Design a protein around this ligand. Structure first.
Ligand SMILES: O=C(O)CSc1nnc(Br)n1-c1ccc(C2CC2)c2ccccc12
Length: 435
């Protein structure tokens, strides 16, 4: 039925967005003896934190350096500011402490994802998306040979097992492998859902595609409340994977109660489609995974993203039916690109405006995804329609490369967002040439 696949391409969105909350990095500082030892450290904890940790980014105490000896020269206003030397610091050998106000436990606070290993979280997202790519590439022959229902049930069981395992992962590589297998099963379920919704009913293909997109949006909106309700990432993953264990009951229906010509032929349309899919993947899996910097409140940001993406992807079908495929797609791409660029243009103090621009950009890239999905069914004739598979593969590759460009934040906090805003502009300018 349609409602079952809607629930199960919600919970998939919930599982995908769980990385945006479980991998969130709270405000952390170096473990200092004058702040975490017994009472003998003494009053005025702010002064102790200032004299125990040097300043860093955003005029805040350095999250990566600690003073070996208390520098009393910094607290006295009669002494000059920034008088300490670099040799007085240490590379945080004693460890780090994290703020338990917003999140009680995360994968960053558990395995100490700090500046020395800050690339692990984008590397974790890249490994997750690589597992998605591997699953989407492998489940093809599996679904073609063993049947779609068998591979669907196996992928559901694998999802549940890997979620339950990652909810209690003792090490970082073990958690990475668990996420890799979970992404394999996620991509299997995604491919099965797509290939089933493409030919179950269909004239109603755009209608069922927009229904699946609205289900995805419902999942986007529900995962925010789920993360707001559960402050522990372990219990969060547990209660997110439990619905898959419940949906596993539908196995076996309650127990019975090649195509390489896409490159030479229509090469222009092919490369344009792969470029749009790559751009969509890039922006979506680079922006939806770092919502902490795009707004002030991650839960409210995701809620607004969902509540504004619902009508956007709703009216996307009206726009496609009235104005056409190419013009509305180019318009949505250019709008998303301009919004993400203005998100870097606006100062960081305008948090509400930054959040609104992020929501608008996410709605625009979702509308662009809907538009390219509708357009892929008509860009190529029936004799060439694995063009859609190549487009999805290019989108998954762009997704994989997504978190890898986030490492450019060392050279500047706007460079990843600058790329995420510049790519859709060129994507729309290239799609404007479509027939
Ligand atoms: O075509 C493909 O299957 C890969 S496209 C892609 N890239 N990042 C992501 Br999230 N997705 C997406 C993958 C899958 C879906 C739906 C549930 C079936 C999505 C729905 C809306 C937006 C993006 C989606």
């Amino acid at each position: 039925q349609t409602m079952a696949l809607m629930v199960s391409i919600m919970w998939l969105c919930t599982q995908s967005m769980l990385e945006n909350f479980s991998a969130a990095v709270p405000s952390h500082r170096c473990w200092a003896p004058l702040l975490d030892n017994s009472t003998a450290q003494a009053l005025s904890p702010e002064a102790l934190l200032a004299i125990s940790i040097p300043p860093g980014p955003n005029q805040r105490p350095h999250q990566c350096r600690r003073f070996r000896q208390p520098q009393w020269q910094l607290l006295d206003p009669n002494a000059t500011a920034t008088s300490w030397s670099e040799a007085d610091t240490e590379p945080c050998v004693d460890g780090w402490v994290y703020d338990r106000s917003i999140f009680t436990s995360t994968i960053v606070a558990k395995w100490n994802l700090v500046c020395d290993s800050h690339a692990l979280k984008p590397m974790a997202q890249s490994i997750y998306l690589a597992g998605i790519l591997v699953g989407a590439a492998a489940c093809g022959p599996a679904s073609d040979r063993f049947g779609r229902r068998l591979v669907l049930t196996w992928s559901y069981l694998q999802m549940a097992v890997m979620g339950t395992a990652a909810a209690f992962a003792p090490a970082f590589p073990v958690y990475c492998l668990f996420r890799f297998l979970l992404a394999f099963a996620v991509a299997g379920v995604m491919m099965n859902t797509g290939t089933l919704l493409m030919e179950w009913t269909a004239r109603a293909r755009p209608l069922v595609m927009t229904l699946n997109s609205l289900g995805f949006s419902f999942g986007h909106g529900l995962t925010a409340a789920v993360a707001y309700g559960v402050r522990d990432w372990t219990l969060l993953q547990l209660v997110v994977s439990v619905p898959f264990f419940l949906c596993f009951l539908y196995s076996w229906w309650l127990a019975e109660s090649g195509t390489l010509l896409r490159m030479p032929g229509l090469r222009f349309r092919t490369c344009i489609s792969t470029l749009c899919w790559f751009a969509f993947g890039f922006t979506f899996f680079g922006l939806a995974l770092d919502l902490q910097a795009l707004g002030s409140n991650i839960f409210l940001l995701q809620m607004f993203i969902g509540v504004v993406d619902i009508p956007a992807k709703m009216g996307a079908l009206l726009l496609l039916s009235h104005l056409g495929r190419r013009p509305t797609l180019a318009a949505s791409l250019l709008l998303a690109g301009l919004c993400i660029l203005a998100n870097t243009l606006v100062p960081h103090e305008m948090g509400a405006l930054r959040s609104a621009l992020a929501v608008l950009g996410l709605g625009g890239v979702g509308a662009a995804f809907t538009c390219i999905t509708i357009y892929s069914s008509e860009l190529f004739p029936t004799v060439l329609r694995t063009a859609v598979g190549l487009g999805q593969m290019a989108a998954r590759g762009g997704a994989i490369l997504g978190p890898l460009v986030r490492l450019l934040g060392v050279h500047g906090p706007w460079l990843p967002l600058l790329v995420y805003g510049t790519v859709p502009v060129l994507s729309g300018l290239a799609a404007l040439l479509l027939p």
